[PDB]
Enzyme design. Structure first.
Site, PDB file in Angstrom:
ATOM      1  N   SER A 292       0.806  -1.250   0.000  1.00 50.12           N
ATOM      2  CA  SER A 292       0.000   0.000   0.000  1.00 50.12           C
ATOM      3  C   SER A 292       0.830   1.288   0.000  1.00 50.12           C
ATOM      4  CB  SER A 292      -1.020   0.021   1.101  1.00 50.12           C
ATOM      5  OG  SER A 292      -2.106  -0.822   0.760  1.00 50.12           O
TER       6      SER A 292
ATOM      7  N   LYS B  53       0.270   3.645  -2.785  1.00 48.49           N
ATOM      8  CA  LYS B  53      -0.835   4.631  -2.882  1.00 48.49           C
ATOM      9  C   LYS B  53      -0.314   6.071  -2.774  1.00 48.49           C
ATOM     10  CE  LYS B  53      -4.542   1.429  -1.332  1.00 48.49           C
ATOM     11  NZ  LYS B  53      -3.760   0.212  -1.034  1.00 48.49           N
TER      12      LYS B  53
ATOM     13  N   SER C  68      -6.052   2.991   3.256  1.00 51.71           N
ATOM     14  CA  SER C  68      -5.472   2.008   2.297  1.00 51.71           C
ATOM     15  C   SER C  68      -6.598   1.280   1.560  1.00 51.71           C
ATOM     16  CB  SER C  68      -4.571   0.997   2.969  1.00 51.71           C
ATOM     17  OG  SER C  68      -3.486   1.614   3.626  1.00 51.71           O
TER      18      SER C  68
END
Length: 267
Positions: A39, A42, A96
């Site tokens: 994640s 991101k 997330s």
């Protein structure tokens, strides 16, 4: 205060800490090892969206069909439902949320493939020579980077205040349409609720292959720093390493890491 700081030793496989007012390295351990970042991907997804100068107030649909890694993955975010681009960025950064991150790449001028290409073009423009992105969520283990490359990314996030602001949001009641439904979301980093922490940006990741990862921009004393810890074997090893770096920079004293953590690294 002439004594000085004792040797610092973290439990994470790779780590890097940098002074954001001089770009000088405060601590570095195996900072060039390529590792899956999950994640933490991101942060790049948000940067690519903000570089396109797309309207944040625009209501966009949950669309994930071009992200093969999302097939069969559970999410409370319903496909075809809609929320602002700003809310999708918030869900991706604070919680997330994978469908939110994928949806952002499905509402990009030039299309989804162009979004992935832009992620890699941005890495190249920032000198992140050991970084590779294949999709915008981090579900792919082929999304890889190094503690040094993620430090370069954290430095770049200084130029995008909204990434840090949405990532440090403590909680959010998200309201979707088509159909109407509301979902409660909270930050994946409990350190945002700790008044002993002064965080400007935070992003966590986890894969069974490399373990826990953490990237943050935080003020320790009077020094804004970039902190990246990767391949943290133990469950809270990444948060414990952040507390070790903080307590160490404040008192100059370092906490001896546990045996289980000491073992994983030495191996």
């Amino acid at each position: 205060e002439v004594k000085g700081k004792a040797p610092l030793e973290l439990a994470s496989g790779s780590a890097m800490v940098v002074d954001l007012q001089t770009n000088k390295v405060i601590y570095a351990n195996n900072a060039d090892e390529v590792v899956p970042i999950a994640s933490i991907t991101k942060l790049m997804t948000a940067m690519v969206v903000l570089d396109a100068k797309l309207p944040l107030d625009e209501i966009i649909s949950v669309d994930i069909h071009q992200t093969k890694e999302m097939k069969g993955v559970f999410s409370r975010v319903r496909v075809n439902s809609e929320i602002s681009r700003k809310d999708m960025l918030l869900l991706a950064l604070m919680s997330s949320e994978n469908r939110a991150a994928a949806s952002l790449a499905h509402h990009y001028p030039g299309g989804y493939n162009a979004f992935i290409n832009a992620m890699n073009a941005k890495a190249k423009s920032l000198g992140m020579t050991k970084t590779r992105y294949v999709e915008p969520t981090g579900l792919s283990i082929n999304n890889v980077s190094t503690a040094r490359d993620l430090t370069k990314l954290l430095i770049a996030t200084k130029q995008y205040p909204l990434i840090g602001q949405l990532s440090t949001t403590t909680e959010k009641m998200a309201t979707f349409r088509e159909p109407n439904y509301t979902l409660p979301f909270r930050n994946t980093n409990h350190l945002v609720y700790n008044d002993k922490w002064n965080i400007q940006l935070t992003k966590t990741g986890f894969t069974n292959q490399a373990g826990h990862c953490l990237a943050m921009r935080t003020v320790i004393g009077n020094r804004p720093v970039a902190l990246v810890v990767l391949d943290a074997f133990g469950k809270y090893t990444h948060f414990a390493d952040a507390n070790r770096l903080r307590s160490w920079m404040e008192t100059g004293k370092a906490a001896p890491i546990p045996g289980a953590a000491k073992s994983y690294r030495q191996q």
